């Protein structure tokens, strides 16, 4: 058997996208909304469905840990995830399965590589709204086992560079874990692009007439970075990533993006854009690096 990183997705977690979809699991009801972005996810959704993966790995900015990088380590986790900032849009009943084996392999490779890693073993733990949103958005069936990874403090507590190298190591470690377990894994970087936003909530949130980029500069950064990924200039996007963060207030600072790409060995490969849109002025692209199609997915033979 062989390990495989089938694909990396840039899969942002704006809860409004699930609000607009009106899934039965989500308590509040909407008139629709954020259709552009929701259509981008539809395109991502069937692109994943066709992949038939063993497991989805997700790195979420809304599980912030100080002591290294944590991994969901309990077979079953459930609960009602309420968004703390937009509880009027996201009150989501969830039930998921964790690929505990892969998570532990990830944690071990993490440890072997110089990172402090941690298994989340508490069964009453509520999986963060960020992870839940990204998962529903790309896989509303909840039928693929999952590996939730925390977003370690480092980029904010230390700085961007020291924090990003740790995400790099974590990525490499994640890759090594996939290949040793022999998983057919899909990577989900749950990051938003430019994160400048409206400080004021709209009377009716679905009112798309009140939805647009918060800044021109922010939007332009998003486009510069997206087209850059689309050209396949992976080297050049990461060369810009520090300034992109400083000036666009990019949520790629959290690290999911550097993690995903490190785990993908930074493939100088054209990304597929499913769509860009804004949520509260916040820039969000739903993007894919298709490694299987590009002949870069297979990792080598697994362990005994």
């Amino acid at each position: 058997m062989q390990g495989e990183i089938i694909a990396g997705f840039l899969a942002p977690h704006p809860p409004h996208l699930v609000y607009g979809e009106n899934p039965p699991q989500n308590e509040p009801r909407s008139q629709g909304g954020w259709e552009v972005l929701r259509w981008a996810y539809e395109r991502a959704r069937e692109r994943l469905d066709a992949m038939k993966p063993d497991v989805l790995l997700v790195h979420s900015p809304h599980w912030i840990t100080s002591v290294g990088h944590h991994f969901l380590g309990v077979p079953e986790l459930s609960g009602k995830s309420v968004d703390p900032i937009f509880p009027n849009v996201f009150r989501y009943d969830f039930s998921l399965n964790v690929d505990v084996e892969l998570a532990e392999a990830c944690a071990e490779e993490g440890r072997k590589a110089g990172l402090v890693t941690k298994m989340m073993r508490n069964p009453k733990f509520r999986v963060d709204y960020g992870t839940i949103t990204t998962l529903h958005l790309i896989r509303p069936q909840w039928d693929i086992p999952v590996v939730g990874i925390s977003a370690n403090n480092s980029p904010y507590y230390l700085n961007t560079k020291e924090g990003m190298s740790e995400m790099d190591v974590l990525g490499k470690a994640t890759r090594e874990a996939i290949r040793k377990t022999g998983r057919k894994a899909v990577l989900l970087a749950s990051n938003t692009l430019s994160h400048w936003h409206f400080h004021e909530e709209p009377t009716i949130p679905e009112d798309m007439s009140k939805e647009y980029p918060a800044t021109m500069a922010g939007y332009q950064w998003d486009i510069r970075m997206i087209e850059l990924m689309r050209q396949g200039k992976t080297s050049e996007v990461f060369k810009l990533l520090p300034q992109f963060i400083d000036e666009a207030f990019a949520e790629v600072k959290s690290g999911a993006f550097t993690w995903m790409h490190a785990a993908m060995q930074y493939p100088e490969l054209a990304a597929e854009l499913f769509g860009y849109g804004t949520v509260i002025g916040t820039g969000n692209a739903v993007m894919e690096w298709d490694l299987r199609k590009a002949g870069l997915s297979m990792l080598g033979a697994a362990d005994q």
Partner: protein
């Protein structure tokens, strides 16, 4: 209006594993503050926590009764945090209304399952607050609010209490020194990560004891940055704002570590 003032730590380690002596000492100190809280017979507890984050408009807990089990996303291995917390809907709702009058857009948060933060839950459990006898008015830590605005928020909530003929106990929940350890440690050898953070902790604490409000003011921003103080020390700003900007002094009921960070229990003498 205000009859009590307290600064309790927002870390759950004191409640979760109090067999660790440093953490146990902080647990008892918070429990003691809770006795002092009760002794002053307040009708409501004006709460602000550093962990209760908001990024748009200011949030006020308006749910009559919030109950459930919280698991800290950092400290899940040390246990669970069950909570049963009453809010003064009447007062909290009045704070939502008064906030825009004082130049701050605000909303109430009344939803079953709403993630009440660790600090509020741990302060509630340890202090005996959040009961129908000591209901809460929780104001959110808006990341875009400075110390100056936090004070405006507390003062505001104190005026609403006056309008409503209610005695108030103010609690600011948050830490001091912010230098958390980056690796797993043995709980019993947890100590303040820096001697520099410790000096800074003991320096400002001494200034709080003396009632040196004027010297406190000019220390807070240098301290907030140099000692990585939990959310810019705005939980103290909350206290100051509630007390209209003056207090006689303070009684430092407890001080200790929380995974390298500094935590302290302060009982203000008004």
């Amino acid at each position: 209006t205000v009859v009590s003032a307290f600064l309790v730590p927002g870390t759950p380690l004191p409640q979760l594993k109090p067999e660790v002596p440093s953490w146990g000492q902080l647990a008892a100190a918070t429990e003691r503050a809770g006795k002092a809280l009760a002794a002053s017979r307040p009708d409501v507890v004006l709460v602000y926590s550093t962990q209760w984050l908001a990024v748009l408009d200011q949030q006020w807990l308006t749910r009559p009764r919030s109950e459930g089990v919280h698991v800290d996303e950092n400290w899940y291995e040390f246990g669970d945090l069950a909570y049963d917390i009453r809010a003064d809907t009447a007062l909290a709702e009045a704070c939502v209304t008064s906030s825009p009058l004082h130049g701050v857009h605000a909303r109430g948060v009344n939803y079953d399952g709403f993630p009440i933060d660790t600090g509020t839950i741990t302060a509630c459990t340890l202090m005996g607050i959040g009961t129908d006898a000591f209901p809460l008015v929780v104001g959110s830590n808006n990341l875009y609010h400075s110390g100056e605005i936090t004070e405006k928020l507390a003062a505001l909530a104190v005026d609403c209490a006056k309008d409503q003929n209610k005695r108030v106990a103010v609690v600011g929940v948050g830490g001091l020194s912010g230098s958390l350890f980056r690796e797993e440690i043995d709980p019993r050898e947890d100590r303040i990560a820096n001697e520099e953070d410790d000096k800074w902790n003991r320096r400002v604490l001494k200034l709080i004891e003396a009632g040196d409000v004027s010297a406190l003011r000019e220390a807070m921003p240098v301290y907030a940055k140099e000692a990585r103080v939990d959310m810019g020390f705005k939980h103290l700003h909350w206290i100051l704002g509630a007390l209209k900007g003056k207090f006689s002094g303070a009684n430092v009921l407890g001080y200790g570590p929380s995974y390298g960070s500094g935590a302290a229990v302060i009982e203000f003498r008004l």
